[PDB]
């Protein structure tokens, strides 16, 4: 009920006083972000709370964050928190621990190099054209557009083609059984009744595992495992067809300790899970900010037209030339860091930067609250891309601004996700301008659940530049 609930009291660390059994989870009734913001305001640089009986130590000092994410990653702070019955997906790189994670990160690191990304760009660009065509249908119909739907389909299109060479126009083919399954790989809501109950009753997770109950949908993981099996068998029957998708990269990495067959499928699944809703969410937030800041949208369209005259198709190198595009993406990720928090489990008693941290504590970095901390950001609630201009970006501490984490366990898809989103943004802004409609919620309100998402879906009027 309370065994660990005296820990922060004994260490002299402030925080909200926990209830028996629940710890502090009733404080999540307005979501993770308001809880972290309010704790930061009332307790200062460090504080502790309890997710059930699990102690969590929040840290905000940039030097201490670097020690945790970078300096002592391999020695002390190697793994994330365990989160529920996970089955074979225990082998997914984001879930793996210690030397198993370190191996998978080695096997998969070459897959995400800029050189491999550059070869994927033509595939990603194809679906920006598909996005533009589908957008244009809804633009000369005058209907306001639900961004999560069109960017959801775009995100899914890019995934299926860059992961498996499966080429689908998912918006217009929603009944395709491939899309029907992958679309179920949505982010977990850790404030939903199931995950709250597992937080209060963590002793039930082994029971769920022994019964093969998994938080990833069994029908979907069964479908995808079967599919990758058949795909790998087909690529054996046609070795002349030279492919550049993530499956082929992992197939090639299986020969000259290497990836097992089930480890391969776990990564295929986690890449869909990692990229699907995140990409569409960020794209939706970005378009919301551009619609509500027309001067920014116009400046960005001017940059795109200067780099790519007359709707010239974007390329790897021309994307990297667009400074203001980078600033807009980075400033939206500052406001809306969809991970909300970074976490590492402390593997052993340590003293870092003068503070003792016991073995077993989860150390948490509250990215959302730090992204909006007025000690580090002038007017942090405002959308101001110039924060990230060449004459201002030196003021930005890389352990305060952490939308993709930091250190050896940072986001391995970061370069891909940025290139993916920028290519979409370029193609859509070459062709359309986005404006608020009657049904647009302004100012945007955030959901009170466990996911960083708008309270109501973002809807925008879409107009052809022609």
Residue positions in the annotated binding site? 411
Residue 68: contacted member of its own copies, ligand HEM, none (CB under 5 to 8 Å, by partner type): none
In angstroms, the CA 345 to CA 360 distance is 6
In angstroms, the CA 323 to CA 311 distance is 18
Which member of 206, 294, 398, 457 binds its own copies (CB under 8 A)? 206
Instruction: Please name which of 385, 396, 376 lies closest in space to residue 300, comparing C-alpha atoms.
Output: 385
Angle between the 218-236 and 261-292 helix axes, to the nearest 10 degrees? 110
Give 106 or 167: the residue with its C-beta nearer to its own copies.
Answer: 106
How far apart are CB 270 and ligand HEM at their closest, in Å? 6
Give 26 or 207: the residue with its C-beta nearer to its own copies.
Answer: 207
Half-sphere exposure for 96 (CA within 13 Å, toward CB): 17
How many residues does the structure list for the chain?
A: 466
* Phi, psi angle pair for 363, to nearest 5°: -90, 130
Residue 207: contacted member of its own copies, ligand HEM, none (CB under 5 to 8 Å, by partner type): its own copies
How far apart are CB 450 and ligand HEM at their closest, in Å? 15
Residues in Cβ contact with 4 at an 8 Å cutoff, skipping those fewer than 6 apart: 50, 53, 54, 55
Residues in Cβ contact with 82 at an 8 Å cutoff, skipping those fewer than 6 apart: 205
Binding-site residue positions for heme? 411
How far apart are CB 101 and ligand HEM at their closest, in Å? 6
Give 52 or 413: the residue with its C-beta nearer to ligand HEM.
Answer: 413
Beta bridge partners of 362: 56, 345
Residue 279: contacted member of its own copies, ligand HEM, none (CB under 5 to 8 Å, by partner type): ligand HEM
Which member of 26, 186, 207, 312 binds its own copies (CB under 8 A)? 207
Residue 20: contacted member of ligand HEM, its own copies, none (CB under 5 to 8 Å, by partner type): none
Kindly indicate which of the ranges 5-13, 134-142, 207-215, 259-267 contains the residues binding its own copies, using the contact rule CB under 8 A. 207-215
- Tell me how crowded residue 332 is: count the other CB atoms within 10 A of its CB: 23
N-to-C CA span, the chain: 65
Tokens of 106: 């080695």
Residue 282: contacted member of ligand HEM, its own copies, none (CB under 5 to 8 Å, by partner type): ligand HEM
How far apart are CB 200 and its own copies at their closest, in Å? 11
Kindly indicate which of the ranges 152-160, 189-197, 206-214, 418-426 contains the residues binding its own copies, using the contact rule CB under 8 A. 206-214
**Residue for token pair 């406001």:** 335
Annotate 260-273 with three-state secondary structure.
Answer: CHHHHHHHHHHHHH
Give 18 or 407: the residue with its C-beta nearer to its own copies.
Answer: 18
Residues in Cβ contact with 73 at an 8 Å cutoff, skipping those fewer than 6 apart: 344, 407, 408, 409
Query: Distance from CA of residue 270 to its chain's centroid?
Result: 12
Instruction: Please name which of 435, 329, 405, 165 lies closest in space to residue 157, comparing C-alpha atoms.
Output: 165
Give 169 or 209: the residue with its C-beta nearer to its own copies.
Answer: 209
Residues in Cβ contact with 303 at an 8 Å cutoff, skipping those fewer than 6 apart: 322, 323, 324, 325
**Residue for token pair 């082998």:** 91
How far apart are CB 209 and its own copies at their closest, in Å? 8
Binding to its own copies by residue 442, rule CB under 8 A?
A: no
Residue 339: contacted member of ligand HEM, its own copies, none (CB under 5 to 8 Å, by partner type): ligand HEM
In angstroms, the CA 116 to CA 161 distance is 14
Binding to its own copies by residue 203, rule CB under 8 A?
A: yes
How far apart are CB 144 and its own copies at their closest, in Å? 52
Residue 410: contacted member of ligand HEM, its own copies, none (CB under 5 to 8 Å, by partner type): ligand HEM
Provide the mask over 328-367, with x wherever binding to its own copies is found by CB under 8 A and - wherever it is not: ----------------------------------------
Q: Cβ-count burial of 149 within 10 angstroms (0-12 exposed, 13-18 middle, 19+ buried)?
A: middle
In angstroms, the CA 344 to CA 349 distance is 14
Residue 203: contacted member of its own copies, ligand HEM, none (CB under 5 to 8 Å, by partner type): its own copies
How far apart are CB 410 and its own copies at their closest, in Å? 27
Residue 94: contacted member of its own copies, ligand HEM, none (CB under 5 to 8 Å, by partner type): ligand HEM
**Residue for token pair 């069964």:** 222
Could you list the residues that contact ligand HEM (CB under 6 A)? 69, 93-94, 105, 270-271, 274-275, 278-279, 282, 338-339, 342, 403-406, 409-413, 416-417
In angstroms, the CA 138 to CA 366 distance is 39
Within 35-92, strands assigned E span: 46-51, 54-59
Give 329 or 459: the residue with its C-beta nearer to ligand HEM.
Answer: 329
Kindly indicate which of the ranges 204-212, 375-383, 389-397, 418-426 contains the residues binding its own copies, using the contact rule CB under 8 A. 204-212
Binding to its own copies by residue 20, rule CB under 8 A?
A: no
What is the three-class DSSP state of 318?
helix
Give 5 or 66: the residue with its C-beta nearer to ligand HEM.
Answer: 66
Give 209 or 305: the residue with its C-beta nearer to its own copies.
Answer: 209
Instruction: Point out which residues bind its own copies (CB under 8 A).
Output: 203, 206-207, 209-210
């Amino acid at each position: 009920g309370t065994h660990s609930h005296g820990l922060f009291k004994k260490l002299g660390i402030p925080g909200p006083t926990p209830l028996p059994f629940l710890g502090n989870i009733l404080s999540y009734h307005k979501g993770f972000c308001m809880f972290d913001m309010e704790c930061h305001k009332k307790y200062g640089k460090v504080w502790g709370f309890y997710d059930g009986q699990q102690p969590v130590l929040a840290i905000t000092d940039p030097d201490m964050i670097k020690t945790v994410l970078v300096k002592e990653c391999y020695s002390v702070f190697t793994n994330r928190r365990p989160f529920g019955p996970v089955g074979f997906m225990k082998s997914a790189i984001s879930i793996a621990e210690d030397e198993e994670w370190k191996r998978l990160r080695s096997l998969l690191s070459p897959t995400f190099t800029s050189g491999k990304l550059k070869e994927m760009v033509p595939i990603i660009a194809q679906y920006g054209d598909v996005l533009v065509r589908n957008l244009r249908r809804e633009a000369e119909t005058g209907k306001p557009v639900t961004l999560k739907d069109v960017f959801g389909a775009y995100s899914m299109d890019v995934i299926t083609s860059t992961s498996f060479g499966v080429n689908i126009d998912s918006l217009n083919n929603p009944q395709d059984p491939f899309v029907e399954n992958t679309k179920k790989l949505l982010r977990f809501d850790f404030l939903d009744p199931f995950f709250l109950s597992i937080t209060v009753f963590p002793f039930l997770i082994p029971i769920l595992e022994v019964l093969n109950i998994c938080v990833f949908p069994r029908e979907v993981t069964n479908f995808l495992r079967k599919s990758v099996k058949r795909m790998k068998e087909s690529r054996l029957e046609d070795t002349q067809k030279h492919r550049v998708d993530f499956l082929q990269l992992m197939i090639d990495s299986q020969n000259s300790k290497a990836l097992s067959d089930l480890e391969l499928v776990a990564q295929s699944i986690i890449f869909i899970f990692a990229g699907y809703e995140t990409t569409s969410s960020v794209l939706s937030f970005i378009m919301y900010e551009l619609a509500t800041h027309p001067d920014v949208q116009q400046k960005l369209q001017e940059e795109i037209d200067a780099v790519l005259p007359n709707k010239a198709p974007p390329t790897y190198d021309t994307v990297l030339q667009m400074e203001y595009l980078d600033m807009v993406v980075n400033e939206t990720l500052r406001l809306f860091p969809i991970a909300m928090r970074l976490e590492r489990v402390c593997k052993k008693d340590v003293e870092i930067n003068g503070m003792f941290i016991p073995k077993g504590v989860v150390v948490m970095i509250p990215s959302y609250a730090l992204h909006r901390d007025p000690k580090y950001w002038t007017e942090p609630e405002k959308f101001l891309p110039e924060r990230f201009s060449k004459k201002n970006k030196d003021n930005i501490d890389p352990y305060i601004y952490t939308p993709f984490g930091s250190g050896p366990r940072n986001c391995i898809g970061m370069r891909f996700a940025l290139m993916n989103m920028k290519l979409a943004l370029i193609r859509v802004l070459q062709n359309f301008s986005f404006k608020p409609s009657k049904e647009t919620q302004i100012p945007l309100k955030l959901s009170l659940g466990g996911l960083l998402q708008p309270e109501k879906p973002v809807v925008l009027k879409v107009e052809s530049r022609d």
